[PDB]
């Protein structure tokens, strides 16, 4: 199912911009043509109506994405070998700050090459690559150079594959629609075999090298990874069970492998991370489970399941026919699959962000506060963006590919017939949550201002205790020995076990208390999430029609309005709902990251002394100061911003410059959001007049930006400015202290 040489390789189409569209290829009468060229670059569905060609175009771009990712990985690995102090950091991870970037001295920018330890001058990095390299057994820079070379080779291979599968042998449509085979392969081979290979690498390389490192041996005296394979005596000395070979595995005497395959739980006191034996056992079990899961769906040999057969058998007295017809929708529309995958990926990213901080998987990662904060905020933002994109593409599918005549589905029909109740109930829930979550903050502020601290919602006057979460913490703290007999310690130290882990005089992790403030902040999170969901679902559900504009589907997915009639019809399209929900996503993620930062700085992170007294960074003021808006403004925003505003003249002045630059970018966006196109089109007419006077009027007539373009520019600049401000503030605050 491939075609030989579908499209000739030529430079002819390079010299004719806009060849993908008939209208754009005509020529640039005005300046709107240039903007329209870029906005429709990757909309393959608008270029042609053939599903096979769209699938072939989609298949090739992923190869370019993979090549770009491989180039990025190659650069990251190469910079750590040539412009880094990784070897010096390896001998003292607790007193040296990782750095992998140096700057050329031209205009006085060499001040950014601050001292970081190990006789090195550079920029301190917070991506956590040093911990990953240490956990993999990497010791010298030659291995990093080899990894960079391999990544370059893989990027070249990906680029060649991308060219080949589009210009020499393009698969047919019947190849793409083999969902059962694709699922079987991506489950058994992509995931299970990868987990098995990583488990093997961890067993044979990471474990002995990491044990030698934790023993305190000089990294230059540790035997090379290949010495543990050729010389089984070394492994037998390290692990006696290796002397028996693979015989216990094939005789089901798996108890002999308990030395390097454990079920301990908790953190390693030496490094502050999870035990590597637990990780190896976890990867082995996950590989087995994924290998089993990949033999469910039917193929050329009869045995297995048919996804259509599974779907068609589920229906209920409330839902009618049920899931019949969903198989044909998901195997014919690219947008629905994209929306579902984007939503699932965003949720998974948020879950990963939440899980990484409380269960540190890398050595010397819990005590690196900047890395933890950066990873948390980065992954949360990525998850939010993916979640928004899911709804955007769901609306796109609803507008374009919906067709009840040939693709009828009962479940989709029933949802669209009672959307008013869903929207009204969601509106009521949002209003109730906003009143009963944010209103308690204003009450506390008013009572504090009036001089009545005894009438506030606080731990000392009127308690609002999160009794349900405390019960979960108590249950999980008592899990070992009762409901998890095979475990020695709890999964996390934050459950409330009472034990504290200190590495290098710093607090890695300890139980986290929950009080009245956590109740309020959690309900604030719920309120913001509910409002965002309301906006996106209202946008998706009313994409085709409404009581105001019955024929909204004919106007398309991205149109500005339908005139000033009916009192005003501004921003009625589904695109405008995504444009509006991006702001609320930004708001929710900012509140969440502020909560995380303040809570960790106030109740977890700190230093321990010889007598064992913990002194936190901010002194534990979160409980009594976060219950008012004035407290958030004073003890968090005003107090913690002194690091970034006093960074001039030092190696951290770049963050100080980025603070003001992001301020300017954020403030600059309000011009596009608060104004309209007619004023700017009328203003241009006067500017064109004087150019005509001096014979400098261009033939490409200048036109003001369209309404949609202006809204997009405004939202983009707004988001960029806000995120850059928060990034600069966080990094400047956390690197110094």
């Amino acid at each position: 199912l491939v075609d030989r040489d579908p499209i000739k390789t030529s430079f002819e189409e390079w010299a004719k911009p806009g060849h993908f569209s008939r209208t754009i290829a005509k020529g640039p009468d005005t300046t709107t043509w240039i903007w329209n060229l870029h906005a429709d670059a990757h909309d393959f569905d608008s270029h042609t109506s053939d599903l096979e060609e769209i699938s072939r175009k989609v298949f090739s771009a992923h190869f370019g994405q993979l090549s770009i990712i491989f180039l990025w990985l190659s650069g990251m690995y190469f910079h750590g070998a040539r412009f880094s102090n990784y070897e010096a950091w390896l001998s003292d991870p607790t007193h040296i700050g990782p750095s992998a970037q140096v700057v050329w001295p031209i205009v006085g920018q060499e001040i950014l090459n601050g001292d970081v330890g190990g006789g090195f001058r550079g920029i301190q990095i917070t991506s956590g690559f040093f911990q990953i390299w240490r956990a993999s057994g990497i010791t010298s820079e030659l291995q990093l150079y080899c990894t960079a070379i391999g990544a370059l080779v893989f990027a070249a291979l990906m680029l060649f594959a991308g060219w080949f599968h589009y210009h020499k042998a393009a698969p047919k449509l019947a190849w793409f629609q083999d969902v059962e085979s694709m699922l079987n392969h991506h489950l058994a081979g992509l995931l299970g075999l990868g987990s098995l290979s990583w488990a093997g690498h961890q067993v044979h390389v990471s474990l002995p090298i990491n044990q030698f490192l934790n023993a305190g041996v000089d990294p230059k005296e540790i035997p090379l990874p290949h010495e543990f394979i050729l010389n089984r005596d070394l492994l037998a000395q390290l692990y006696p069970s290796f002397a028996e070979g693979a015989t216990p595995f094939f005789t089901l005497n798996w108890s002999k492998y308990s030395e390097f395959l454990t079920f301990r739980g908790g953190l390693d006191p030496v490094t502050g991370g999870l035990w590597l034996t637990d990780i190896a056992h976890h990867h082995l079990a996950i590989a087995i489970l994924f290998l089993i899961a990949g033999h469910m769906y039917r193929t050329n040999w009869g045995i297995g399941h048919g996804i259509k057969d599974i779907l068609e058998a589920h229906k209920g007295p409330f839902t009618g026919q049920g899931h019949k017809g969903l198989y044909e929708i998901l195997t014919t529309s690219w947008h629905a699959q994209l929306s579902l995958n984007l939503a699932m990926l965003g949720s998974l990213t948020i879950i990963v962000a939440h899980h990484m901080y409380s269960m540190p998987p890398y050595p010397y990662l819990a005590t690196d506060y900047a890395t933890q904060l950066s990873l948390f905020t980065h992954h949360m933002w990525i998850g939010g963006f993916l979640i928004v994109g899911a709804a955007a593409h769901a609306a796109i599918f609803m507008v374009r590919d919906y067709d009840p005549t040939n693709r009828y589905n009962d479940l989709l029909d029933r949802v669209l017939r009672h959307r008013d109740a869903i929207i009204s109930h969601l509106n009521w829930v949002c209003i109730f949550l906003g009143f009963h979550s944010f209103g308690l903050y204003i009450h506390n502020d008013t009572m504090s201002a009036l001089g009545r601290p005894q009438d506030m919602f606080s731990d000392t006057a009127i308690q609002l205790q999160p009794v349900f979460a405390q019960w979960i913490q108590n249950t999980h703290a008592l899990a070992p020995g009762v409901t998890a007999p095979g475990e020695t310690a709890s999964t996390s130290l934050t459950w409330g076990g009472g034990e504290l882990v200190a590495v290098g005089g710093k607090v890695a992790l300890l139980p986290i208390p929950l009080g009245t403030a956590d109740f309020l902040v959690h309900h604030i999170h719920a309120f913001t999430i509910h409002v965002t969901v309301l906006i996106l679902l209202k946008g998706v559900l009313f994409a085709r029609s409404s009581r105001l504009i019955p024929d909204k589907a004919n106007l398309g997915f991205r149109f500005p309005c339908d005139g000033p009639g009916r009192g005003g019809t501004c921003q009625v399209s589904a695109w405008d709902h995504v444009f509006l929900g991006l702001f609320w996503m930004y708001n929710a993620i900012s509140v969440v990251i502020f909560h995380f930062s303040w809570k960790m700085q106030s109740d977890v992170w700190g230093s321990i002394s010889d007598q064992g007294v913990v002194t936190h960074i901010t002194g534990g003021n979160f409980a009594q100061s976060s219950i008012t808006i004035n407290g958030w403004l004073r003890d968090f925003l005003w107090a913690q911003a002194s690091q970034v505003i006093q960074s001039y003249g030092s190696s951290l002045s770049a963050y100080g410059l980025f603070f003001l630059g992001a301020h300017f970018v954020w403030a600059f966006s309000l011009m596009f959001l608060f104004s309209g196109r007619g004023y700017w089109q009328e203003l241009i007419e006067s500017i064109v007049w004087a150019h005509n006077k001096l014979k400098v009027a261009p033939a490409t007539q200048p036109r003001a930006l369209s309404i949609i373009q202006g809204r997009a520019v405004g939202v983009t600049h707004y988001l960029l400015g806000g995120i850059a401000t928060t990034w600069a503030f966080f990094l400047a605050r956390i690197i110094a202290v």
């Binding site: 105001l548 024929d551 339908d562 005139g563 000033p564 009639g565 009916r566 009192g567 019809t569």
Partner: protein, 80 residues
Amino acid sequence: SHSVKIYDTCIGCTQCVRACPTDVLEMIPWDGCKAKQIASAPRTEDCVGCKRCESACPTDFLSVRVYLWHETTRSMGLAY
């Protein structure tokens, strides 16, 4: 009700009546253009004011003009 007017720069291409979301505009015979036609607005009480007619006029400046005026239950598009 809104006010809709037609001016004698009409060329009678029937583009405004086809874009009308309600039944407001119509064509009548005329003399003064090649097409021998001109538009008319006999049912302005059904006008909503979305101004789709002006988006379809090919004449340099519009031969059909809509002036927003006193609002009723029909011109506001309410189905309460």
